[PDB]
Structure formats: structure tokens, C-alpha cells
Amino acid sequence: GCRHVAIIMDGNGRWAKKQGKIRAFGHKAGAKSVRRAVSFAANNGIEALTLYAFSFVWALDSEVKSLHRHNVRLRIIGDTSRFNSRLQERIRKSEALTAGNTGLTLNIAANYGGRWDIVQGVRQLAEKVQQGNLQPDQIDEEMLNQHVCMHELAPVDLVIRTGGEHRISNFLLWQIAYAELYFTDVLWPDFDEQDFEGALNAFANR
Amino acid sequence: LPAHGCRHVAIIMDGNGRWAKKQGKIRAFGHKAGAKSVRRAVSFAANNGIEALTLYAFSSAQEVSALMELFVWALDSEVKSLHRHNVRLRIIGDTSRFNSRLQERIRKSEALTAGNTGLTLNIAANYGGRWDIVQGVRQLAEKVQQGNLQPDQIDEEMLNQHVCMHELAPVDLVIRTGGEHRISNFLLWQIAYAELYFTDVLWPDFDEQDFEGALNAFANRE
Numbered sequence: 001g002c003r004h005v006a007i008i009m010d011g012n013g014r015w016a017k018k019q020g021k022i023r024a025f026g027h028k029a030g031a032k033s034v035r036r037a038v039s040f041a042a043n044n045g046i047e048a049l050t051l052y053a054f055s056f057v058w059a060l061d062s063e064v065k066s067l068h069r070h071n072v073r074l075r076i077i078g079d080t081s082r083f084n085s086r087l088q089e090r091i092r093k094s095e096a097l098t099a100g101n102t103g104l105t106l107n108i109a110a111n112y113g114g115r116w117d118i119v120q121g122v123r124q125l126a127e128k129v130q131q132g133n134l135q136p137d138q139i140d141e142e143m144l145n146q147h148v149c150m151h152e153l154a155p156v157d158l159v160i161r162t163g164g165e166h167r168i169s170n171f172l173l174w175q176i177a178y179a180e181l182y183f184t185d186v187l188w189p190d191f192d193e194q195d196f197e198g199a200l201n202a203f204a205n206r
Numbered sequence: 207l208p209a210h211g212c213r214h215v216a217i218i219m220d221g222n223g224r225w226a227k228k229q230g231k232i233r234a235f236g237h238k239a240g241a242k243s244v245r246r247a248v249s250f251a252a253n254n255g256i257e258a259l260t261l262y263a264f265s266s267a268q269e270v271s272a273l274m275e276l277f278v279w280a281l282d283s284e285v286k287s288l289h290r291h292n293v294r295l296r297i298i299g300d301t302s303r304f305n306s307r308l309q310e311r312i313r314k315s316e317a318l319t320a321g322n323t324g325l326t327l328n329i330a331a332n333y334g335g336r337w338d339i340v341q342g343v344r345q346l347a348e349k350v351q352q353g354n355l356q357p358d359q360i361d362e363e364m365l366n367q368h369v370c371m372h373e374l375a376p377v378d379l380v381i382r383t384g385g386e387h388r389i390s391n392f393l394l395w396q397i398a399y400a401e402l403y404f405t406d407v408l409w410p411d412f413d414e415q416d417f418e419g420a421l422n423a424f425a426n427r428e
């Protein structure tokens with residue numbers, strides 16, 4: 001029954017160091033791990049996959065055609081307002097291209113913070129109050145929920161963090177109120193289909 | 207700073223029901239054992255240099271009613287002992303719907319212990335992490351409407367100043383007993399950077415050595 005999985009992808013740098021290689025090498029292997037995890041979720045009927053790089057987006061827009069062919073809807077979540085204008089437009093175009101797709105929804109966090117996400121929704125509500133279009137006492141959990149990232153998708157069912165640390169590190173906060181939390185010491189470049197299925201079992205067991 | 211590095215521990219206390227069932231005992235016995243484990247953990251935190259301990263009794267009309275009974279009886283029975291151990295007691299959660307006599311007893315218990323200089327003990331009662339954020343948001347929205355605040359002045363530090371426990375040390379460590387790996391709408395905003403520590407030990411069995419195990423895991427992982 002797992003509909004929406006979120007992953008904190010950690011361990012690329014530490015993997016590279018264990019390999020006796022520089023950081024770039026771990027990023028390349030981390031990108032291979034992204035492709036594998038996205039294929040696996042799309043092929044196993046997961047509705048939404050949300051990926052957070054913990055410690056990029058330009059490396060990504062060479063993959064959009066392939067996502068589109070696979071019926072993946074791509075969304076970026078996070079504060080892209082200070083990205084350069086050309087990158088912002090490439091993000092917008094890639095979202096627009098795939099927006100109609102009905103397969104896996106892939107959310108890529110880019111300069112995302114779970115507190116930022118809440119604050120951006122609160123600011124929207126504050127504007128509405130200032131305009132006289134909303135009473136402070138009318139603000140409830142449903143209403144805030146409507147102004148935080150991914151409110152259109154299935155609730156996050158499972159959060160996986162690779163890399164060994166046992167923290168959310170200001171990834172999703174509002175959205176993980178009822179999610180299963182699964183931590184694995186496996187470093188992100190090594191995280192493969194067996195590791196993903198193991199997380200899915202922790203979920204199903206429970 | 208204590209050697210373990212931990213200023214503020216929050217605990218999701220789960221496993222009372224399962225503990226009683228394993229014993230072939232009704233729920234009430236698990237609740238009595240769980241209360242003994244609360245007193246033990248409070249004493250442990252107070253003696254090991256923790257500044258703040260925040261406790262959440264996991265449960266999931268009759269649910270509300272059992273939770274009210276637990277709270278009312280605890281406030282009745284335990285506040286004098288807290289005061290005599292120099293503990294400063296605070297209740298966090300939406301207590302606005304409690305009848306005015308109960309809200310008065312909460313106020314008097316908080317007032318009584320407010321000058322205490324030992325452990326600060328926060329007890330969640332009708333608490334949810336989402337509710338906590340929402341109440342803070344409503345405080346800000348009132349400031350906007352009573353022209354004192356511009357929407358674009360609202361930032362994370364500002365919202366942080368309106369959620370429960372903002373004046374205490376940040377939560378460093380969340381422990382959940384009882385085997386589930388979920389926050390279950392306990393603290394959300396406040397746990398953005400916290401160490402999350404899950405143990406299969408059932409709440410009534412979680413003792414000083416388990417608590418020491420969680421702090422030393424914090425000290426070593428931080």
C-alpha cells in the first residue's frame with residue numbers, strides 16, 4: 001500500500017572517499033542511483049517519488065525527454081526564485097512539458113527546506129489576510145495544507161534516509177506527520193532495488 | 207553543556223497496552239507501569255543535566271475521555287512532587303477547550319512551579335505538531351490584521367518565535383519507544399534538526415539504562 005515515497009539521498013561524498021576518488025565521482029554514481037530509483041518506483045506502481053539531495057539541477061535537464069517518454073510528471077519543489085532566469089525558464093518548460101503525464105510524479109527538491117515550505121504558505125495566507133480576504137480564525141490545518149508543497153498528491157507514506165544519519169535535516173516537516181521513517185546505513189550510490197524493496201517491506205510489515 | 211551534549215529530549219512514550227497484554231493484564235496495569243516509567247525518566251533527566259524533557263503519551267469520544275482522565279489525575283497527583291524536586295512544569299497543546307476549572311488547575315500548577323530552576327518538564331495534552339504550527343500562524347495573522355506585521359517580514363525565525371517551546375533549547379533528541387518508526391503528529395517544526403532514536407523497548411520497561419543508551423547514542427552521532 002505505499003503510494004508516495006520520499007528519499008533523503010545522503011552519502012555520495014563519503015562513498016567517493018571510500019572509493020579513493022574525489023567528490024565529483026560520487027555525484028556521478030549518485031546520479032546513476034537516482035535513475036535506478038526512479039525506474040524502480042515507476043515500474044512498481046508508486047504514485048509519487050520525492051528526492052532530496054543532502055550535503056545539480058543543470059545536470060538534470062538532459063533527462064527530461066526520457067522522463068516524458070516514461071509518462072513521468074516532473075515537479076521541482078523549493079525556492080528557485082534566485083536561480084538565474086534561464087535556469088528558471090528551463091525548469092518551467094520541463095514542468096510544463098510533463099505536467100499532463102499520468103504515471104509517476106517525480107518531485108525533485110531544489111533549495112528546498114521544510115520550514116521554508118511552511119513559511120511560504122504562511123506568507124500567502126498573510127497576504128490574503130492583509131487584503132481583507134481571510135479572517136485569522138478561519139485558518140486551519142486543511143487551509144495551510146493547501147498552501148504547502150505537494151498538497152495535490154497522495155500523503156507521504158514512507159521517508160527513506162540513506163547514508164547512516166538519523167535526522168530529517170529540514171526536509172519535509174508538515175508532510176511527514178504520519179509517514180513511516182526508514183533509516184539505512186547504505187550510502188546513496190550503493191542504494192539499489194533490493195534496498196528500496198527492503199524499505200517497502202518495513203512499510204508493509206508495519 | 208553536559209558531556210552527552212543533549213539539552214532537550216522529547217519522548218513519544220508508546221507500548222503501555224502491549225506491555226499489559228504480554229502480562230495477560232488489562233490496560234490499566236500498563237498505565238500504572240507507564241506512570242512509574244514517567245517518574246523514573248523525569249528523575250533521570252533531572253539528574254543528568256538535561257534542561258528540558260518533553261513527553262507525549264501516544265494513543266493513536268472514549269479516547270478523548272481516557273486521555274482526559276490520565277491528565278486530570280496526573281495534574282492532581284504529581285504536581286507537588288515535581289515542585290519538591292525543583293521541576294518547572296509546562297503544558298503544551300490546545301487546552302482552550304478544557305472546561306474552565308481544569309484550565310484553572312493547569313494555570314495554578316504552572317504558576318506554582320514557574321520559579322523552579324531544575325528540569326523544565328513539558329507535558330503534551332491535546333497536542334499535535336500541525337496544530338502547533340497553525341496556532342503560531344494564527345498569531346501572525348492577527349498581527350497582520352491588527353496592522354502591526356507585513357506579510358513579507360514573515361520568515362522562519364519569526365514563525366519559530368510563535369511555536370510551542372520556542373524559548374527553550376532546541377530539541378536535540380527525539381526518542382520513541384514501543385517499536386513504531388513514526389512521529390505521529392508530535393513535534394514537527396521543532397524536530398527539523400533533531401536526532402531521531404527509535405527503540406523496540408516498551409514504555410513501561412524503558413529504564414535509566416535505556417535512557418543513558420539514547421543519550422550516549424546522541425553524544426556519539428552528533
Ligand SMILES: CCCCCCCCCCCCOc1cccc(O)c1C(=O)O
Nearest residue numbers: 034035038039042060061063066070108
Ligand atoms: C531535474 C530533473 C532530472 C531528474 C531525472 C532523474 C533521472 C531519471 C531519468 C529516468 C531514466 C529512465 O527512467 C525511467 C523512468 C520511469 C520508468 C522507467 O521504466 C524508466 C527506465 O529507464 O526504465
Ligand SMILES: CCCCCCCCCCCCOc1cccc(O)c1C(=O)O
Nearest residue numbers: 245248249252280281284287288291329
Ligand atoms: C501533568 C503533570 C504530570 C507530571 C508527572 C511526572 C511526575 C514525576 C514525579 C517526580 C518524580 C520524582 O522525580 C524527580 C524529579 C527530578 C529530580 C529527582 O531527583 C527526582 C527523584 O529523585 O525522584
Ligand SMILES: CCCCCCCCCCCCOc1cccc(O)c1C(=O)O
Nearest residue numbers: 241244263270273274277280331332333
Ligand atoms: C506520573 C504520571 C504520568 C502521566 C502523565 C504524563 C502524560 C500525560 C498525557 C496526558 C494527555 C492528555 O491528552 C488529552 C487530554 C484531554 C483531551 C485530549 O483530547 C487529549 C489528547 O491528547 O487528545
